[PDB]
From a paper:
As for many such viruses, TYMV genome replication is dependent on the activity of a viral proteinase (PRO) to properly process the virus' replication molecules. First, its endopeptidase activity is required to proteolytically process 206K at the HEL/POL junctions to release the 66K polymerase, while a second cleavage at the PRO/HEL junction contributes to the regulation of viral RNA synthesis. Finally, we recently reported that TYMV PRO also displays an ubiquitin hydrolase (DUB) activity in vitro and in vivo, and identified 66K polymerase as a specific substrate of this activity.
The asymmetric unit contains a single PRO molecule packing against the next PRO along the crystallographic 31 screw axis, making up continuous PRO helices in the crystal, and an Escherichia coli contaminant (ribosomal protein S15). S15 bridges the separate PRO helices, explaining why diffraction-quality crystals only grew from a PRO preparation heavily contaminated by S15. The continuous helices of PRO in the crystal are formed by the insertion of the C-terminus of one molecule into the catalytic site of the next. The catalytic dyad Cys783-His869 (TYMV polyprotein numbering) lies at the interface between helix α3 (the first helix in the central lobe) and strand β6 (the last strand of the C-terminal lobe). In contrast, the catalytic dyad of TYMV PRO Cys783-His869 is completely solvent exposed. The last five residues of the substrate 875-Args-Leus-Leus-Glys-Sers-879 are funneled in an extended beta conformation towards the catalytic dyad of the peptidase Cysp783-Hisp869 (where the peptidase residues are labeled in white and the substrate residues in black). Second and most important, we identify the Tymoviridae-specific N-terminal lobe of PRO as a recognition element for surface patches of the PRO/HEL substrate, as this lobe was found to recognize a signature bulge made of the two successive cis-prolines in the PRO substrate molecule.
Numbering used by the authors:
A (entry chain A): 732 to 879
B (entry chain B): 1 to 42, 51 to 88
The structure:
Amino acid sequence: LPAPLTNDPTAIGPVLPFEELHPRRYPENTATFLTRLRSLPSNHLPQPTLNCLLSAVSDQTKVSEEHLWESLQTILPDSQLSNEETNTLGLSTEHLTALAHLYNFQATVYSDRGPILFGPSDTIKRIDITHTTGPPSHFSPGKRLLGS
Amino acid sequence: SLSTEATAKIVSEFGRDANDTGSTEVQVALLTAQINHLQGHFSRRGLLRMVSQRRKLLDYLKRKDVARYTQLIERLGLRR
């Protein structure tokens, strides 16, 4: 079990897969990442410097980055929102899954190696987000396909 | 849920007097006792519901008076 997560003051209860705490119809091997129930209210963390996942989702949902970020703070413990990883490498498809649950959409992520689904299927809203390793590793709104 | 006796004891501890049931502190403390009871058996839905409501009450209090919020969460040991 992730030690920072098990000592996170904003969290309560056992460490469990996201989908166990927030059951939806998630694609296989997504929503399996470990987390805990959010207990304490928002600390109003600064938006991440590396925030283009939020910008990409914002473009697609018409929800401001600030609102997306405050929403994440209602469901994930702070240790999962502000840490060494987020500050150096940015947000991840785990955050995307959390947003997809909160805002009831399913995202198709058009990665360098093809489209990947993240978010609950028991939804109507659909969004498109592109990811590339680049460099730099970058999310953006819309579709992208590669091949020969 | 909570017996009338348990409820009364919590109101006494966290409220101004027995009639102070508008107090956010009291409401949060009552939920906490139920939440702790529920984990004591471990209705995962009931647990989420209470944690969620409590979080929103805490948010309400934190926005009004950070110092009261801080004192309350320490008294209840909500920081693990």
